[PDB]
Design a protein around this nucleic acid. Structure first.
Ligand SMILES: [Mg+2]
Ligand SMILES: [Mg+2]
Ligand SMILES: [Mg+2]
Ligand SMILES: [Zn+2]
Ligand SMILES: [Zn+2]
Ligand SMILES: [Zn+2]
Lengths: 34, 180, 53, 50, 242, 243, 114, 51, 40, 87, 48, 249
RNA sequence: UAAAUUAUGGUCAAUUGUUAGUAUUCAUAUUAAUUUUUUUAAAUGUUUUAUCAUUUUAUAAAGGUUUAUUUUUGAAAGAUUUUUUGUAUAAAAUUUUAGGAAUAGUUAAUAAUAAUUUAUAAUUUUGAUUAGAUUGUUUUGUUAAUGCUAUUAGAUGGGUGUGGAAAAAUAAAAAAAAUAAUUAAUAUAUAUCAAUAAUAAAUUAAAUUAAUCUAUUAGUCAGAAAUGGAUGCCAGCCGUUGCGGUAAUUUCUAUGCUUUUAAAUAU
């Protein structure tokens, strides 16, 4: 995990990755996630 | 066909056309130099890979000893080797079917390989370029002249179909009695 | 020679025997983001760019 | 054997291959780490047994 | 089963062998002469054309055997001074024979086509080769030369001086002093002769199915000149029992 | 010190032929060999081995090794590493090489490296010597005292000797096998007109060899190089045809 | 930071197979060289350069002194032209003119300066 | 592919080792069996056995 | 390129090229001899 | 590892800075003493930035330019940059 | 090596920086791993 | 490691229990263990006397001859005749799609194939001929052949095979005698495979890693002290101010 | 819901950082790369012709694009000749930002329509539109490995619209309508690329053509190796835990020692 990507802490990068998670992808059941 | 011509590297009849076989090689130290026979269009962009019809093969212009072969007392077989890797099928397809062009260095390499006659560039300074006379040429033509029928037959064999079917093959191929 | 070590590299002009001659593009460059806007005054109104994207 | 009825002598039925005759006596061959005096075993001279 | 499309008529190829056609020959496009040993090519060419094309291998084998014979004639005796400061060595002909045997047999370069021409190229005098090697080994045991380098003691003190292909002098090595004759070197020569005798029948290229009286007398000469008493006695007994 | 002109490319390593050996061009290569120190003792001196290296003693250059290199004749050892000046007496040729490669190896005169018609086949030449098979060439060599030694060479040998051409009295370099026109069997054939083109030096070798073509074109009204093939044209087995 | 773990270095061991003598043949033996005699159109190398001065950027006329005579001019190669302090373009022009004359093409080129 | 410093096309077909002159290890007069086994032959990775 | 002999027709024009594209009849004849080798 | 410490380096390990001020700072207790701190100024992308660094360099002359390196962790509470060693 | 193993590889807590890390933990973890090893003959007997 | 069922032997047991023989020597012949030619080769590959006659085709006896190809006529005649004559051998090998695959080396080298790989060797005299088998095989990636079945091949990366720098990163004198480092008394060197029998030479093997020289994941053995490093580097202490030479040289 | 075998086959998966009660991948290792010891220009006149003209010479960096870049055989290759046969501008999918809301000469039908036709139009919370960032889907680095981390050069509007095709305003490693050259690969000034450069780091010599050339090894508390003097929480040192309070194995310095070796330091 490159330090410049997203925030300084790694949980920023992990939260940014979690928005692209296939299981949580936007759909009828899970919508307006952000 | 440009307002300001690229004077450094001009060509003829514009782009893209007339595929031509050349020998591309990056300008490096001579001891690490090796060219690549390749067929490409007349005009090439900054990177040669844009216009690349086919790849003929590598050529190393370094005379090397035959270490792979055993140490043989044959004098000719112990001369230095200049290895060149070339393709035959693609070369013939581009030369004949598509009627491509060749540069002097690939022509000389292929003449060495036996695919082509010696190029016009390579000439012996000892022997001057001769001249011709119509009367003497006519005299030689009358002295020896081939038959029209045999010349037509050999032209047909050389240019048109040459793998002909003879009467033995025709009799073998003809249908058998039950379906007659 | 990518498989050779740094000190084992006698020369870099060609591949002596065979393999893959690949450019060693430097991935570890330490790219830097320069903050040019106030925290609550990023010009965009929906998405904010506060780091290397 | 062609009809799969011959008693199969598979290699796995073979056990250990015993040493019939004793090969020889391997005497202690000289090495850089075996010297009567330790003077010749120095960091400027000796880096290993061989 | 019958809804959607009629069965293609090309499925009949799998049930009728009558439609399997190869309208042209395998090499009908001019490759009929690709194989050099095919009966078709041999018939279409003729014996004279065959010898014309094989003259290359014939002359290769001729050059090999001529060079081997010249080296044998030059180094028949292992002691002497052929050049200004170079001596005779059996090692040169040994290396040449090893190179020839590797060209004939070694799987790194399977140049086995030379063996086909042994019938018309091999000299009758060189038909017995390991006997010649045994004779050279017998000559190698002269007491005035180093058993290791075959150099005279009077003119040289280090082994391999004045020899281009010396294996006793590497790029950054040290000169090796002349070795003095002894029973150790006599036994070394005896073991070399034994190995030569075994190879004389083991070799399938230059070896003979049965040993030669020339080889036997050469081995006896080796034994007598190396002063192997019991070894020579046992060799004589086994010669009687052969 | 020594000061010369230097350019950016001047730091490019030179090419090394197959015959050439390892070169100590880099400082890393120079350091280990500079580490060792040499000395000439009684057992190390070359003059004490004249019974074996008499050829080396004869071929060494007495004078030019003292002024240009400041190394004594009695200081040079038989395994000397520094390159000194040599005057090969087989052809009287000057060069510069060390004594280690002359004694341990056989690396002497560069011209004499091509003494025999084949580098691989040294003494296998069955050709008669020049002094027997061509008495007309010994008089054309440059008079330097080694004419007899060069005349002892084979006719087909590949020696690169000097010749005073009769066209303009000039000394040009050519090969004796090229001059004689014949080559040993099994080697690469030479040019058919090599005798005519090697008779003179390159400056005066153009007109005399172009006289016959001028005569031919004047006679026939045209010049054509194929007359050589025509005179050859003026049974042979063959294969069958599949067409 | 400290450096490479082990500097990989290799010995030099001479190879007898690589150092074995190699057959060679001079290219002059296959094709003998020759120097064309001066003609009426070109009596000397000086007027040869004068004729071979066509480009404004290739002043081959000014280098009469560098070449001693006809033999020197027709024998010096490109490397010799370089070591004689001749610029690349003009030395290439001189070499091409010499080669054309040897082939049989005199320097009959119109001056393009005007 | 062609006409570049890193043009990796002529290395995709088999070729013998080049020994015209010194290629960094004095290949013109050096027996390069060990050199071929340890440097020239491609490996699975840095330091692994030759492929 | 196309070779232009020095002994050709000089275009007496300052507003254009200094040499013409014509040629001497000898130049035409010798060109044919050279072109004959090209056809061979 | 800490990546926000080297904020003023901006990627490069060496920062070419000028010299304006030099004072003394007391390191965090119990490590009592005075340490020489250099208040330096540089300009990057037409923007001037000033930073406090550790004056590790020994004085042998008068200097107006300095090289800022990341260094390690120092007991001084707030400064995170060292001066290049004198060569 | 003291245990006599010739073909084995042991790893503790992935990268060495990962906690906990102490000599006592390093010794006891590898000893526990070696103790919890089942021989091939024992596995075959268990499988019958 | 394989686990069979405890009744796995039933298939062979019924054969052994219901086998019948004419005589007892047929029952207890010592060659009942050999069934196929592979078994016979594995059994009689030790001695050469039986092998050389039982398997005559193992030794290469007849190879591909070298022939000269008919040259293409050059209509220019003697003017371009010199062009084909050079001072170097010209080696040309065909490539393509079918040609060049190493997996099909046997088919490409097999003369009985009309699509075999083509080669040309133009000699300096100007004539072209077919390449030798060695030259044909030179256009493929090298492979090592070795078989440990009967005789151990010359193993690479050994005490004697490897040179000084590859052994200990230091120069040692390369002497034929008095080499305590190599643990030998005298090494008189004959030709490697002259006296030794040909069949004893089974090739060489180099498909492994020399652990002393080059290994995977060269990491420091222990961090502190910093002096120690990876096991691949074993060196002695460097002297200081070795020696100086008065002679210029 | 049966075992296997006519016995290793079909070609190598393998992990190494001396910590510090415990929780959590976060100081110091190795590889790859940058950094010191001064390695490393992108050339100035393209050519021919029927003469104030005509014919041949079509993608270099400039402009910041995430629902996005897509097209010709009319020139040329190209051939007894005439003649003939065909196209093609369109798509589909992958599309970045910590804190997220509206967008627009606009959708469809019609037509060689409509600045002024007809219609309940189109985009978007399944993340649109503006804004910021970055030249897009064969390139690396690391690892045993589903990962993580890189990559390049070039399509930035028209406006007498030449041409087959605008790519058309300095920038070559492109021989361009006569064989200029094949002994050629060598390349002397002004902004830049890897030809940039990696070369037996110290004992028997270079089968040659002898051509280019110097830098302090860093430490010595823990942990390879330290004793005397001076300082006395001062001056300073410090990858780390920390050291300096009058015997300091941690500072400075004399001397001595250590090193698995060619640096040191940082990101
Ligand atoms: Mg950062
Ligand atoms: Mg934008
Ligand atoms: Mg205290
Ligand atoms: Zn001796
Ligand atoms: Zn001489
Ligand atoms: Zn003359």
């Amino acid at each position: 995990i490159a330090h410049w990507y997203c925030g300084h802490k790694f949980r920023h990068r992990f939260m940014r990755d979690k928005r692209f998670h296939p299981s949580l992808q936007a759909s009828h059941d899970a919508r307006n996630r952000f | 066909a440009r307002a300001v011509i690229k004077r450094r590297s001009p060509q003829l009849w514009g782009a893209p056309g007339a595929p031509i076989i050349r020998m591309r090689g990056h300008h490096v130290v001579w001891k690490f130099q090796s060219y690549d026979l390749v067929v490409e269009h007349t005009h090439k962009r900054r990177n040669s890979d844009i216009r690349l019809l086919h790849y003929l093969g590598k050529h190393c212009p370094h005379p090397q000893k035959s270490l792979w072969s055993p140490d043989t007392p044959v004098a000719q077989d112990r001369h230095l080797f200049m290895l060149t890797t070339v393709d035959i099928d693609a070369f013939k397809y581009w030369f004949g079917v598509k009627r491509c062009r060749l540069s002097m260095k690939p022509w000389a390499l292929l003449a060495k390989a036996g695919l082509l006659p010696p190029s016009l560039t390579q000439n012996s300074k000892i022997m001057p370029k001769p001249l011709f006379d119509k009367e003497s040429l006519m005299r030689y033509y009358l002295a020896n002249r081939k038959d029209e029928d045999v010349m037509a037959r050999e032209k047909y064999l050389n240019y048109e179909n040459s793998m002909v079917k003879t009467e033995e093959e025709r009799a073998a191929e003809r249908p058998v009695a039950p379906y007659l | 020679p990518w498989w050779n070590f740094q000190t084992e590299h006698r020369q870099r002009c060609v591949l002596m025997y065979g393999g893959a001659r690949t450019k060693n593009t430097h991935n570890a460059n330490h790219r830097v983001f320069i903050k040019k806007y106030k925290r609550n005054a990023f010009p965009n109104r929906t998405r904010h760019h506060w780091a290397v994207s | 054997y062609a009809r799969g009825q011959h008693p199969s002598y598979d290699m796995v039925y073979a056990g250990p291959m015993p040493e019939i005759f004793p090969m020889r006596r391997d005497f202690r061959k000289p090495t850089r780490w075996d010297f009567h005096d330790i003077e010749k075993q120095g960091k400027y001279r000796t880096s290993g047994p061989y | 089963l019958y809804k959607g499309i009629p069965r293609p008529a090309i499925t009949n190829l799998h049930y009728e062998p009558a439609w399997r056609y190869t309208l042209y020959q395998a090499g009908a496009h001019g490759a009929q002469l690709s194989n050099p040993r095919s009966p078709f090519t041999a018939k279409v060419l003729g014996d004279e054309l065959m010898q014309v094309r094989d003259i290359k291998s014939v002359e290769h084998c001729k050059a090999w055997f001529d060079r081997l014979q010249y080296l044998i004639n030059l180094h028949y005796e292992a002691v002497g001074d052929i050049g200004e400061f170079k001596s005779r060595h059996t090692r040169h002909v040994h290396e040449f024979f090893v190179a020839f045997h590797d060209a004939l047999s070694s799987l790194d370069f399977r140049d086995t086509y030379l063996f086909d021409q042994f019938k018309a190229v091999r000299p009758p005098e060189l038909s017995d080769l390991f006997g010649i090697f045994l004779e050279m080994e017998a000559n190698y045991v002269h007491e005035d030369y180093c058993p290791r380098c075959s150099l005279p003691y009077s003119t040289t003190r280090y082994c391999g001086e004045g020899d281009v292909d010396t294996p006793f002098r590497k790029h950054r090595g040290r000169w090796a002093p002349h070795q003095k004759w002894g029973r150790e070197w006599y036994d070394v020569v005896a073991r070399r002769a034994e190995a030569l005798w075994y190879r004389a029948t083991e070799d399938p290229y230059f070896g003979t199915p049965q040993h030669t009286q020339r080889q036997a007398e050469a081995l006896l000469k080796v034994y007598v000149q190396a002063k192997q008493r019991g070894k020579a006695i046992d060799f004589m007994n086994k010669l009687r029992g052969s | 010190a020594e000061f010369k002109q230097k350019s950016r490319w001047s730091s490019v390593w030179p090419n090394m032929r197959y015959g050439s050996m390892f070169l100590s061009y880099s400082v890393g290569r120079k350091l280990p060999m500079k580490g060792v120190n040499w000395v000439t003792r009684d057992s190390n001196r070359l003059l004490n081995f004249s019974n074996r290296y008499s050829a080396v003693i004869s071929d060494i250059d007495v004078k030019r090794t003292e002024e240009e290199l400041n190394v004594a004749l009695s200081d040079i050892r038989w395994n000397d590493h520094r390159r000194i000046y040599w005057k090969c007496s087989f052809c009287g040729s000057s060069y510069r090489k060390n004594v280690s490669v002359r004694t341990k190896y056989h690396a002497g005169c560069n011209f004499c490296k091509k003494k025999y018609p084949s580098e691989v086949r040294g003494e296998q030449h069955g050709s008669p010597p020049v002094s027997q098979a061509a008495p007309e060439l010994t008089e054309q060599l440059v008079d330097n005292g080694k004419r007899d030694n060069l005349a002892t060479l084979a006719v087909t040998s590949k020696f690169y000797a000097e010749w005073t051409c009769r066209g303009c009295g000039g000394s040009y370099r050519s090969t004796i096998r090229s001059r004689t026109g014949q080559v040993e069997a099994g080697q690469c054939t030479l040019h058919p007109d090599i005798v005519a083109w090697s008779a003179y030096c390159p400056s005066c070798s153009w007109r005399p060899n172009m006289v016959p073509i001028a005569e031919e074109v004047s006679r026939s009204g045209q010049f054509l190089g194929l007359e050589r093939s025509m005179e050859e044209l003026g049974p042979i087995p063959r294969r069958k045809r599949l067409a | 930071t400290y450096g490479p773990h082990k500097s990989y270095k290799y010995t030099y061991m001479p190879d007898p197979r690589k150092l074995a003598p190699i057959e060679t043949t001079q290219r002059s033996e296959i094709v003998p060289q020759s120097i064309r005699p001066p003609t009426s159109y070109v009596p000397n190398h000086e007027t040869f350069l004068e004729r071979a001065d066509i480009h404004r950027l290739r002043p081959t006329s000014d280098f009469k002194a560098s070449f001693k005579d006809w033999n020197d001019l027709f024998t010096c190669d490109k490397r010799q032209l370089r070591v004689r302090g001749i610029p690349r373009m003009t030395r290439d022009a001189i070499r091409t003119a010499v080669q054309a004359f040897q082939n049989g093409n005199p320097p009959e080129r119109f001056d393009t300066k005007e | 592919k062609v006409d570049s410093f890193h043009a990796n096309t002529q290395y995709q077909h088999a070729w013998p080792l080049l020994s015209h002159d010194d290629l960094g290890n004095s290949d013109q007069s050096n027996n390069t069996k060990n050199i071929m086994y340890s440097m020239y032959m491609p490996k699975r990775n840095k330091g692994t056995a030759p492929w | 390129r196309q070779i232009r002999p020095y002994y050709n027709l000089p275009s007496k024009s300052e507003h254009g090229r200094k040499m013409t594209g014509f040629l001497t009849p000898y130049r035409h004849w010798m060109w044919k001899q050279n072109e004959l080798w090209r056809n061979v | 590892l800490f990546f926000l410490r080297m904020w003023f380096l901006y990627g490069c390990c060496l920062r070419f800075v000028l010299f304006v001020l030099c004072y003394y700072m007391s390191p965090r207790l119990p490590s009592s003493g005075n340490r020489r701190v250099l208040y330096a100024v540089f300009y990057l992308y037409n923007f001037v930035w000033m930073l406090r660094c550790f004056f590790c360099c020994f004085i042998g002359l008068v200097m107006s330019l300095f090289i800022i390196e990341g260094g390690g962790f120092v007991d001084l509470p707030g400064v995170k940059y060292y001066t290049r060693i004198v060569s | 090596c003291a245990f006599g193993f010739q073909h084995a590889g042991c790893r503790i807590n992935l990268k060495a920086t990962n906690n906990p890390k102490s000599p006592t933990h390093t010794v006891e973890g590898v000893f526990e791993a070696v103790k919890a090893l089942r021989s091939v003959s024992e596995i075959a007997a268990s499988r019958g | 490691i394989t686990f069979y069922s405890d009744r796995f032997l039933f298939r062979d047991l019924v054969n052994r229990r219901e086998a019948s023989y004419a005589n007892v020597w047929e029952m207890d012949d010592p060659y009942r263990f050999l069934q196929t030619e592979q078994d016979y080769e594995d059994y009689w590959g030790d001695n050469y006397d039986v092998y050389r006659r039982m398997f005559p085709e193992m030794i290469g006896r007849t190879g591909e001859p070298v022939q000269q190809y008919g040259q293409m006529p050059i209509w220019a005649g003697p003017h371009r005749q010199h062009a084909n004559k050079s001072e170097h051998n010209w080696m040309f090998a065909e490539i393509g799609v079918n040609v060049g695959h190493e997996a099909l080396k046997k088919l490409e080298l097999d003369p009985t194939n009309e699509k075999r790989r083509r080669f040309v060797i133009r000699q300096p005299d100007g004539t072209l001929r077919s390449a030798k088998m060695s030259e044909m095989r030179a256009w493929y990636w090298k492979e090592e052949w070795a078989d440990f079945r009967f005789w151990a091949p010359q193993m690479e990366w050994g005490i004697e095979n490897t040179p000084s720098q590859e052994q200990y990163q230091e120069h040692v004198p390369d002497t034929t005698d008095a080499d305590f480092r190599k643990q030998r008394r005298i090494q008189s060197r004959p030709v490697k495979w002259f006296y030794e029998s040909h069949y004893t030479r089974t090739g060489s093997f180099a498909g492994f890693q020399p652990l002393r020289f080059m290994q995977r994941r060269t990491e420091r053995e222990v961090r502190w002290p910093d002096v120690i490093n990876a096991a691949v580097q074993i060196q002695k202490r460097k002297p200081a101010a070795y020696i100086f030479k008065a002679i210029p040289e």
